[PDB]
Design a protein around this ligand. Sequence first.
Ligand SMILES: COc1ccc(C2=N[C@@H](c3ccc(Cl)c(Cl)c3)[C@@H](c3ccc(Cl)c(Cl)c3)N2C(=O)N2CCNC(=O)C2)c(OC(C)C)c1
Ligand SMILES: [Cl-]
Ligand SMILES: [Cl-]
Ligand SMILES: [Cl-]
Ligand code: NA
Ligand code: NA
Length: 91
Amino acid sequence: PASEQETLVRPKPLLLKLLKSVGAQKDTYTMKEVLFYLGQYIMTKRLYDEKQQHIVYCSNDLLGDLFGVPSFSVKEHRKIYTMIYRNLVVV
Ligand SMILES: COc1ccc(C2=N[C@@H](c3ccc(Cl)c(Cl)c3)[C@@H](c3ccc(Cl)c(Cl)c3)N2C(=O)N2CCNC(=O)C2)c(OC(C)C)c1
Ligand SMILES: [Cl-]
Ligand SMILES: [Cl-]
Ligand SMILES: [Cl-]
Ligand code: NA
Ligand code: NA
């Protein structure tokens, strides 16, 4: 039974590299999967303020190259989705 809301995506090379560091290599991922893995990448590289864990600092990491920003709050969903879509194509 199909989820009509699902999004299937093919990541650009740098995003694929970050996904493979934390997760499995696939040709296509779902958006939910990409969001999960990006969050888990931030957790394992400790790219947040220990005292303010909803703020991400990514400028000193490939994630900052991927997103094109030095930092962001996890509340900034439009920004985060927008930067993610700039790093993939929808299948
Ligand atoms: C209080 O500390 C927090 C509170 C909320 C989030 C958290 N927000 C989720 C999310 C979803 C969509 C968008 Cl569009 C954005 Cl912006 C953020 C998700 C996540 C996904 C992708 C990215 Cl890129 C980022 Cl930053 C964050 N997400 C987590 O991954 N969490 C929380 C649940 N379980 C976890 O283990 C980790 C949070 O995330 C950390 C990694 C900074 C911290
Ligand atoms: Cl999805
Ligand atoms: Cl790229
Ligand atoms: Cl914003
Ligand atoms: Na902070
Ligand atoms: Na496409």
